[PDB]
Design a binder for this molecule. Structure first.
Ligand SMILES: CNc1nc2nc3c1[nH]c(=O)n3Cc1cccc(c1)OCCOCCO2
Length: 154
């Protein structure tokens, strides 16, 4: 009982782009760019779409870096998130009614104001590792258990 989602991190050698979500999903946390894959769309197309729609950036190459399955206790649908990274972008990120984009130096990532699972996988992302992960959450703030392993093939 899963539903497909994309998540894109715009990661250049000195810095990463995150957006503060002003409302709705993930509000009040620094998020990457992503959402539900639509009907007739490949996962990679959906990721490019979500980045563009949400960030204002246009991406050339996307690289798949991970898959994370989220379980929220009591919610029937598992969220199957396909995670991608790019360093080849065009444009300037645009602040909108839904999000406030900001660049962070890699040693100043705001983990305290991010989803708590990010402290586990973001360091793999930053070191160019690919991963499979699973996080069981109670509410949005508590990780009950998780697994996370590095893989050769996402
Ligand atoms: C940078 N880390 C995270 N960024 C986001 N959500 C994040 C990030 N880390 C995280 O746990 N989430 C929540 C989450 C949970 C289930 C499905 C999800 C996201 O779909 C991926 C699309 O989410 C876009 C919002 O960005």
């Amino acid at each position: 009982a899963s539903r497909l989602y994309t998540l894109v991190l715009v990661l250049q050698p000195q810095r990463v782009l995150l957006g503060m979500k002003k409302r709705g999903f993930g509000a009040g946390r620094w998020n990457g760019f992503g959402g539900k894959v639509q009907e007739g769309e490949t996962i990679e197309d959906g990721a490019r779409r979500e980045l563009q729609e949400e960030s204002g950036l246009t991406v050339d190459a996307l690289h798949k870096v991970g898959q994370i399955v989220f379980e929220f206790v009591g919610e029937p649908e598992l969220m199957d998130v396909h995670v991608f990274c790019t360093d080849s972008i065009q444009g300037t990120p645009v602040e909108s009614d839904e999000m406030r984009p900001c660049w962070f130096q890699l040693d100043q990532i705001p983990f305290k104001d991010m989803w708590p699972d990010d402290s586990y996988w973001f360091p793999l992302l930053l070191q160019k590792k690919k991963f499979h992960g699973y996080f069981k959450f109670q509410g949005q703030d508590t990780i009950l258990d998780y697994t996370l392993r590095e893989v050769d093939t996402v």
